[PDB]
């Protein structure tokens, strides 16, 4: 069904920061100059997702997890009830 | 045959609404309209009780309002210091899914009871520290629900058939038995000078027996729905009961009818448990929607809101010297409230 | 039969909670009333007791 | 550099584990995963250190 | 006190027409789920047909699809049957049950011996003469 | 003074030791539930499992395959009324519900049993495994044809067998034309309400049948695999 | 150019991980097995960011 | 046939064979019958008296 192929579509994308694929693609890339479009394309891509994937990892996991938003949820409106 | 019983009971059952309405002479609200109110109560949790592996289903105090009894559904039967939360005891249960827990008024025994409608009765007497099953009971078909101590030999015992004994514990058998339910009794309250107790059952009605003659007094029906819980007014001549129906009904003894409703609009949950205060002007009423209620017994206003929970409030108990109380949830936690100046 | 006996019991039941004593609302009440009142200071809960004599700090 | 990386290993594994294994111990595993994410990269940069030093 | 009469049945010629009133007094009508239970001679309690609070979903038995009409009534705090082309087999004493819960699609022991939120019920006989 | 609270303090950690090791064992173990109408040969079942050696109210049985153990749970001595002591259920593994097929009569009654289940508003999420029990007794039914189905439920009529069914060359095509309605008519109730929540995995058992033991092992393997990857939301 | 990329993105990675760290310790609710690797994981990143820095 | 079945529906006893055979009630179990030591003494009583 549709639904499922989303749902799995979904599931790979939230899944794929944290198990870091994205590292797969230069994986096995030996040293090449540095006045190179292998060398450019590399630096750019790397410096890029690795740096960002800590930042994707907190969002997916901590700021978007379910059980933390309902906490969250509860503390502060708690805390405005009793202040 | 039938034509002609059924007929009389119905008579009989509009002389008792009669009789009722001929004694309203008035309302408890009407006559409670000049009373300063109780005002918003914050209550902070004070201590935090964990170590129960599933949920928990019932709690007692004690006497000198230290230790308590809390029973768990996987087999756990833990006794708690209040204070230093400190753990004295915990029972390995025979068997795991566990309803009910006491508290004997002199601490020398603790019993319990279940879906195997057995009452097993632990004592804590024992020189060499190892606790042990001091009696059980096998005498109820249903599940057992609820039980209370008399004294050191005497306990009542609530179950699912419809029916409550009268055990004593030094022969095991039972020495007065109470069928007058049409449905499965949930809880029973004991009066504080222990010659009467209700009992709550599934049929919406509130029944009074005598531990002596045990014979019932008096009926109340005014709930609309299965009564969960029950309990005693500190002065002994009212109880108050709670039910799924989302609203809790305070009963007269001497007026034989329902005083006041604390029913909320925008509540539509059920009732766990509920317990009067060491004066009786609040009634803590736990609510399946993850939190509880302090109601005022006399203005039927929410003084205030106790909401430390992260499932239902399946118990909740108050200390005799009302210093503090104690609430225990499905999520494995004891929480214990008390006010602040 | 069971019916009949169940009957039976009821209407002995009803009989017996019908001749028992009643005492007036209004003088019920008051009982309930002056009970609060008396014990009204001995309550810490309705009266909040000073941090140095309360137990739990 | 390391103990970052082999902590994405560390959540691969665990998560492997926990689907494809009926029973866990919490604290067995737990200790042993965070000793391979921390200490395994400590003995490579130290092996490492070594030989250059 | 929860209480439920049931009016109407009685002898009944097979293919004719019947109609059953439940009376309900003492909670709110509303609130709560509605139920229809028969018991055949020397039979046990089978479940008839539910109506919900609102009426906007019912749902009947496989023997009785097609021939019987559930309706409530909220303001007048009554529940019927409308029953058409009776079959001999049929003949049986109704109960109106109350689901035993408010705001809730189940109810567990409607269909149980000793049910305490049903009415007496009524007798109906689909007997040819 | 601190003699006491010394002495109490031991006591407490050594309380703790003894819950940290049961902490261990209770979830080790999975436990299950299991229920229906006595007209299912429930107690043929509890017979089989009972092979797995390792006022009377509920009994359990414990038996072990694959060196995980389970605790099946049976009410036989309790009230017929079952809406207050199955609450304490809501932790169970899983529930499973037996259901004779071959009673006709008495299926619309496992139906509603099972749609009270299925709906409750506590076991939200715990899943249910129906074992349609002794499917010999249905076959054996449908072959003779005094007794017709069409007459219970007048849908059957117009009912034809699922493309995906699966069966078994030597059986007749009517005796899977009636198990597959059944088995449809209990997933209509199933993904009627239940979306992801909790699953409902069909079965086809006999009573003689010593596989029970392995569909359940599969089907609490799945539940606990489900429940994982929604804890990622994944699924 | 590749520089400015990677202490940007390090940045802002180290800001939300420190919050996600903050948050998950303080709550006692989502103290777990997951969790607790989950803010080892997180950790690591941080400790790769700030060394880099 | 099947005296797996009468045995289950004995044990469970929601159905009384008395009501059909009313003569069950004033039945013994035969001396000479053999009756399995594992089996209940209420599912031998009711399967003898089939077979008397």
């Known amino acids: 069904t549709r639904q499922q192929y989303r749902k799995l579509l979904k599931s790979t994308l939230v899944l794929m920061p944290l198990f870091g694929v994205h590292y797969i693609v230069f994986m096995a890339t030996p040293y090449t100059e540095v006045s190179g479009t292998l060398w450019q394309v590399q630096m750019h891509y790397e410096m890029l997702f690795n740096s960002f994937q800590g930042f994707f990892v907190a969002i997916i996991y901590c700021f978007c997890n379910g059980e933390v938003q309902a906490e969250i949820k509860k503390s502060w409106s708690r805390w405005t009830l009793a202040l | 045959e039938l034509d002609q019983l059924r007929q009389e009971a119905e008579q009989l059952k509009n002389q008792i609404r009669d009789a009722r309405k001929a004694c309203a002479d008035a309302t408890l609200s009407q006559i409670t309209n000049n009373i300063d109110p109780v005002g918003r109560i914050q209550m902070r949790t004070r201590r935090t009780l964990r170590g129960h592996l599933a949920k928990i289903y019932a709690m007692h105090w004690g006497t000198d309002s230290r230790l308590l009894v809390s029973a768990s559904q996987d087999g756990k039967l833990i006794i708690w210091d209040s204070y230093t939360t400190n753990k004295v005891h915990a029972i390995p249960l025979r068997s795991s899914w566990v309803m009910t827990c006491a508290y004997a008024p002199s601490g020398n025994y603790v019993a319990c009871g279940g879906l195997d409608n057995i009452c097993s009765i632990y004592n804590l007497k024992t020189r060499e520290g190892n606790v042990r099953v001091s009696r059980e009971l096998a005498g109820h078909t249903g599940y057992l629900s609820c039980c209370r101590f008399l004294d050191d030999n005497q306990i009542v015992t609530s179950s699912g058939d419809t029916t409550c004994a009268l055990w004593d514990i030094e022969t095991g058998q039972q020495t007065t038995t109470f069928t007058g339910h049409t449905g499965d009794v949930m809880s029973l309250s004991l009066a504080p000078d222990t010659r009467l107790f209700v009992s709550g059952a599934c049929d919406a009605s509130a029944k009074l027996w005598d531990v002596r003659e045990g014979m019932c007094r008096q009926t109340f029906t005014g709930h609309e729905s299965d009564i969960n819980a029950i309990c005693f007014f500190p002065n002994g001549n009212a109880f108050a009961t709670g039910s799924d129906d989302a609203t809790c009904r305070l009963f007269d003894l001497r007026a034989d009818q329902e005083l006041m409703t604390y029913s909320h609009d925008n509540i539509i949950c059920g009732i766990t448990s509920v317990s009067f205060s060491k004066s009786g002007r609040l009634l803590l009423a736990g609510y399946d929607d993850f939190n509880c209620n302090v109601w005022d017994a006399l203005k039927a206003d929410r003084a205030g809101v106790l909401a430390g929970h992260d499932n239902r409030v399946s118990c909740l108990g108050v200390t005799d010297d009302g210093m503090a109380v104690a609430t225990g949830s499905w999520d494995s936690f004891l929480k214990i409230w008390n006010g602040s100046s | 039969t069971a019916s009949i006996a169940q009957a039976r019991k009821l209407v002995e039941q009803l009989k017996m909670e019908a001749n028992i004593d009643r005492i007036k609302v209004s003088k019920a009440a008051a009982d309930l009333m002056a009970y609060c009142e008396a014990h009204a200071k001995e309550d810490p809960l309705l009266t909040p007791v000073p941090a140095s004599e309360n137990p739990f700090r | 550099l390391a103990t970052n990386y082999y902590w994405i290993l560390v959540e691969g594994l665990y998560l492997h584990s926990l689907i494809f294994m009926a029973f866990f111990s919490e604290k067995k595993y737990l200790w042993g995963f965070t000793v391979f994410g921390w200490g395994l990269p400590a003995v490579f940069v130290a092996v490492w250190v070594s030989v250059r030093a | 006190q929860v209480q439920l009469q049931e009016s109407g049945g009685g002898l009944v010629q097979p293919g004719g027409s019947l109609r059953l009133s439940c009376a309900a007094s003492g909670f709110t009508f509303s609130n709560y789920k509605m139920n229809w239970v028969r018991q055949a001679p020397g039979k046990g309690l089978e479940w008839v047909s539910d109506?919900?609070?609102?009426?906007?979903?019912?749902s009947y038995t496989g023997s009785v699809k097609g021939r019987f009409t559930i309706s409530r009534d909220n303001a007048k705090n009554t529940l019927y049957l409308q029953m058409n082309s009776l079959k001999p087999e049929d003949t049986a004493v109704y109960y109106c049950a109350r689901c035993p819960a408010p705001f809730t699609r189940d109810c567990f022991d409607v269909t149980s011996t000793t049910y305490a939120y049903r009415g007496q019920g009524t007798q109906v006989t689909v007997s040819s003469h | 003074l601190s003699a006491e609270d010394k002495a109490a303090v031991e006591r407490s950690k050594m309380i703790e030791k003894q819950l940290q090791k049961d902490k261990q064992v209770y979830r080790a173990t999975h436990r299950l539930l299991l229920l229906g109408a006595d007209n299912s040969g429930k107690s043929t079942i509890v017979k089989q499992m009972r092979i797995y050696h390792v006022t009377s109210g509920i009994f359990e049985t414990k038996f072990q395959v694959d060196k995980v153990n389970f605790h099946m749970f049976d009410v036989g001595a309790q009230r017929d009324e079952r809406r207050k002591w199955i609450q304490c259920f809501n932790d169970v593994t899983a529930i499973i519900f037996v259901v004779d097929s071959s009673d006709y009569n008495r299926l619309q009654e496992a139906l509603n049993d099972f749609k009270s289940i299925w709906n409750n508003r506590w076991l939200r999420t715990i899943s249910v495994i129906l074992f349609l029990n002794k499917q010999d007794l249905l076959a054996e039914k449908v072959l003779a044809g005094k007794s017709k189905i069409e007459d219970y439920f007048p849908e059957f009529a117009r009912y034809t067998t699922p493309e995906d069914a699966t069966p078994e060359p030597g059986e007749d095509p009517r005796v899977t034309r009636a198990k597959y309605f059944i088995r449809d008519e209990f997933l209509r109730i199933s993904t009627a309400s239940g979306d992801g929540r909790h699953y409902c995995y069909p079965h086809f058992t006999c009573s003689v049948d010593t596989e029970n033991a392995r569909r359940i092992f599969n089907d609490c393997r799945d539940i606990i695999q489900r429940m994982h990857l929604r804890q990622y939301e994944l699924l | 150019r590749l520089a400015m990329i990677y202490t940007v993105g390090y940045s802002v990675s180290l800001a939300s991980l420190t919050v996600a760290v903050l948050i998950l310790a303080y709550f006692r609710r989502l103290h777990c097995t997951r969790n607790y690797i989950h803010m080892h994981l997180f950790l690591s990143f941080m400790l790769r960011a700030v060394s880099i820095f | 046939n099947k005296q797996d079945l009468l045995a289950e529906k004995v044990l469970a006893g929601k159905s009384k064979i008395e009501d059909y055979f009313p003569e069950f009630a004033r039945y013994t179990t035969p001396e000479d019958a053999t009756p399995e030591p594992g089996e209940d003494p209420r599912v031998t009583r009711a399967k003898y008296f089939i077979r008397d």
């Open positions: 109506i919900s609070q609102s009426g906007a979903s019912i």
